[PDB]
């Protein structure tokens, strides 16, 4: 049976080689993308649109938010030194929360957010918080309380930061699939991974591009530059192109309009910076906001232009987390990446 | 007070330092000074295993020294027949980002896992003959970097969440958790009796664990950067680590410190994988420079080079009978060396 089982071995092999050949065609025809974002980057909202047109954890965040305030206010009278409120006009705010708590399937009305937010600036309500050591309170309580103004919004999608505080994520990696002009894309974004990336990021050395989403107008912007500087110069990622989404242009526009100079104090060279003359502002926007957004772009290109060498490229894009044009930018960038990869094999560039 | 506990940690750290210098009055390079060198070890590629579409991240030899499983990040476990180069099974994985694979000593299962944070057990000798997922072990909160079977029903995993876990495969439950590392855990190696294992982490330290008691016995420092690779000496009384500081080191469990450092001035890249030959006279180490160096583990001289890969050497394994070395690479090839 030495030759009998050698013909069964080599025939099971060629069957696998046929399946491996169909595998190869599917693997080659798909573009793989890594989505890396800042904590408040707004990455997830961009995924939310790339998906609808697994971030469904919006309600769970609200659960812990509602469950947090209820314990704090219900413990006010329970404490042996009972805690008094700083403003008596917040009395009715406590009343409402004391009733609506411990009910199934709460809707979270804005009036609830009004009492919840208004109670948190109250010193007396906060006074019991430092005594939350003596009673039982959720770990991620003060984090979400400061963030209610973000959560009141209709379009709220939990950032990764938000998901780490709670124990919502069970999945190491999330995958999004989409198709632009009959070309398939596999977008990945890490879920339950620690903030140390230096080991698992080497897995993505052969992706078509890394989609790097920056929470523009935030330091958190110097932090994004250092992460991009680490990705750009990594030994294993210096043949990987980076698609750079400078995300919160709409919030960046508002702060420069108002006079919120967190940008200039964090970057003293913003004072002696002038908009490049070949800039293309969106007609109907402040000549100061086009300066602020082109300054952040010029920070990433300072890193990018050094040590590029034609191995990989940076594609900066001013974006907004609510845009259907974003998948097209990725598709166009990936076409340029693939064309340059092919042109470099023929030594045409 | 926290600051009082810190200053007690330093003096206990000085006491172990002093209790280790007490027994380190002779070096391994004095004991092994008259030992005649092994000679130029010249291995050649005997088999190149082609069929993976993307870089190979891990491999494991089966205990019969003929079948080996290899994981690539195109999403495939391939089980090869190294003698005839015929693929026995090709397993498509649910998550493509596999970072480790294990062959059961009984030969009936493989395991794999990666950035999905799950270790997946596959039944090879099933009812109707097609490989299917039998159990999925979830509970790690970081990527699964290494998995090693104890028997058909237990498996140890190391994870990016800085812990290792002992599993019961029949019920899918974590029988034990091994905490104590500060960086994430990159590799583990079982002792020949399987009652202990050692883990190497991204905090430049290695730890020895009692499998049945769940606690750390000894901690080994000396490396300067993240430890990528760990492997037990054939008798279970020593192990060798490979780190990003470009050196390999050898530690003895009973002297409770390191004995040997394997480094050269021209070697400035991290070690990805280590493995001993059957007798433990050679230490084989894969490198980021696309090469594998053979080290005379008793004299710390380089004895040879495995020089046939076009990309990073990612994994490395020696058969149980000691007949061949398998090297996996980011160029998507497996090479078998003699």
């Amino acid at each position, epitope marked *: 049976d030495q030759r009998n089982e050698e013909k069964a071995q080599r025939e099971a092999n060629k069957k696998i080689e046929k399946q491996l050949q169909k595998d190869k065609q599917v693997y080659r025809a798909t573009h793989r993308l890594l989505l890396l974002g800042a904590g408040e980057s707004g990455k997830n909202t961009i995924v939310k649109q790339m998906r609808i047109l697994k971030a469904t954890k919006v309600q769970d965040i609200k659960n812990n938010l509602k469950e947090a305030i209820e314990t704090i206010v219900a413990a006010m009278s329970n404490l042996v030194p009972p805690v008094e409120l700083a403003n008596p006009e917040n009395q009715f705010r406590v009343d409402y929360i004391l009733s609506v708590m411990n009910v199934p399937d709460f809707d979270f009305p804005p009036e609830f957010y009004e009492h919840a937010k208004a109670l948190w600036e109250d010193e007396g309500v906060r006074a019991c918080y430092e005594r939350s050591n003596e009673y039982q309170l959720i770990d991620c309580a003060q984090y979400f309380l400061d963030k209610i103004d973000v959560i009141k919004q209709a379009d709220y999608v939990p950032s990764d930061q938000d998901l780490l505080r709670c124990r919502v994520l069970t999945s190491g990696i999330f995958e999004t699939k989409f198709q632009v002009d009959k070309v398939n894309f596999h977008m990945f974004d890490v879920g339950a991974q620690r903030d140390e990336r230096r080991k698992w990021i080497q897995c993505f050395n052969d992706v078509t591009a890394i989609i790097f989403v920056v929470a523009s107008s935030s330091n958190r912007l110097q932090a994004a530059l250092k992460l991009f500087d680490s990705i750009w110069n990594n030994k294993w990622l210096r043949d990987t192109s980076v698609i750079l989404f400078l995300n919160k242009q709409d919030l960046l526009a508002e702060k420069v309009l108002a006079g919120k100079s967190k940008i200039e104090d964090y970057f*003293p060279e913003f004072a002696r910076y002038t908009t490049p003359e070949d800039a293309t502002p969106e007609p109907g926007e402040d000549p100061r906001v086009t300066r602020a957004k082109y300054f952040i772009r010029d920070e990433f290109l300072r890193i990018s232009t050094a040590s590029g060498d034609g191995r990989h490229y940076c594609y900066p894009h001013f974006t907004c987390s609510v845009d259907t044009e974003n998948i097209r930018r990725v598709f166009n960038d990936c076409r340029d990446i693939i064309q340059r990869m092919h042109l470099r094999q023929y030594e045409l560039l | 007070e926290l600051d009082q506990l810190r200053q007690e940690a330093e003096q206990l750290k000085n006491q172990i330092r002093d209790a280790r210098k007490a027994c380190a009055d002779a070096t391994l390079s004095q004991i092994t000074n008259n030992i005649d060198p092994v000679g130029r070890i010249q291995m050649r590629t005997r088999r190149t295993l082609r069929g993976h579409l993307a870089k190979i991240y891990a491999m494991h030899w089966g205990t019969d020294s003929r079948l080996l499983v290899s994981a690539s990040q195109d999403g495939k476990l391939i089980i090869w027949d190294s003698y005839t180069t015929n693929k026995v099974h090709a397993i498509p994985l649910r998550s493509s980002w596999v970072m480790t694979c294990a062959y059961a000593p009984s030969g009936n299962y493989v395991a794999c896992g990666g950035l999905d944070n799950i270790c997946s057990i596959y039944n090879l000798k099933t009812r109707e003959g097609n490989v299917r997922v039998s159990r999925e072990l979830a509970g790690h909160t970081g990527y699964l970097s290494c998995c090693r079977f104890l028997d058909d029903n237990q498996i140890v995993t190391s994870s990016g969440d800085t812990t290792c876990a002992l599993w019961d495969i029949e019920t899918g439950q974590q029988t034990t958790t091994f905490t104590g590392h500060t960086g994430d855990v990159m590799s583990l190696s079982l002792a020949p009796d399987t009652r202990l294992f050692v883990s190497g982490a991204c905090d430049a330290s290695a730890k020895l664990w009692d499998v049945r008691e769940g606690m750390c016995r000894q901690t080994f420092t*000396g490396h300067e950067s993240d430890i990528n690779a760990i492997c037990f000496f054939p008798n279970g009384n020593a192990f060798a680590t490979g780190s990003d500081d470009a050196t390999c080191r050898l530690f003895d469990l009973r002297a409770d410190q390191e004995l040997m450092t394997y480094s050269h001035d021209n070697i400035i890249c991290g070690i990805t994988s280590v493995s001993f030959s059957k007798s433990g006279r050679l230490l084989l180490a894969g490198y980021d420079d696309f090469n594998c160096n053979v080290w005379d583990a008793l004299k710390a001289d380089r004895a040879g080079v495995l020089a046939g890969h076009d990309n990073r050497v990612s994994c490395l394994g020696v058969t149980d009978d000691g007949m061949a070395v398998a090297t996996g690479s980011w160029d998507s090839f497996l090479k078998i060396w003699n």
Partner: nanobody
Amino acid sequence: QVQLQESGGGLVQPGGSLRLSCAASGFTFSNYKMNWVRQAPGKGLEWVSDISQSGASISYTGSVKGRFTISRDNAKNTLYLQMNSLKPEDTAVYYCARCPAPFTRDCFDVTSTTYAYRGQGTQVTV
């Protein structure tokens, strides 16, 4: 055993001066890129300054440029941070952080919460 021990620090007046020191041991100091990283009360860790292996290439977070000076002594295995004209927004625990791997341009994770190759910190209070 990689060990980083920050020295200097302590209470100082606004506009004052301090010189933090980092006595490193257990690794080839000249092979690694070194960083200063600080954690203000309430906020997370953030990068202040880095210096390359030789000491020629230097960078700073923008809020300290012109006021801080980083330097290393490769013979004495020491990192320095000269802090001139301190402002109360400089009150932080200051950590000396090593880049995880030698001979690299990239420096991952030094601002991470549980980064191994970081000291315990000196409290600077302005």
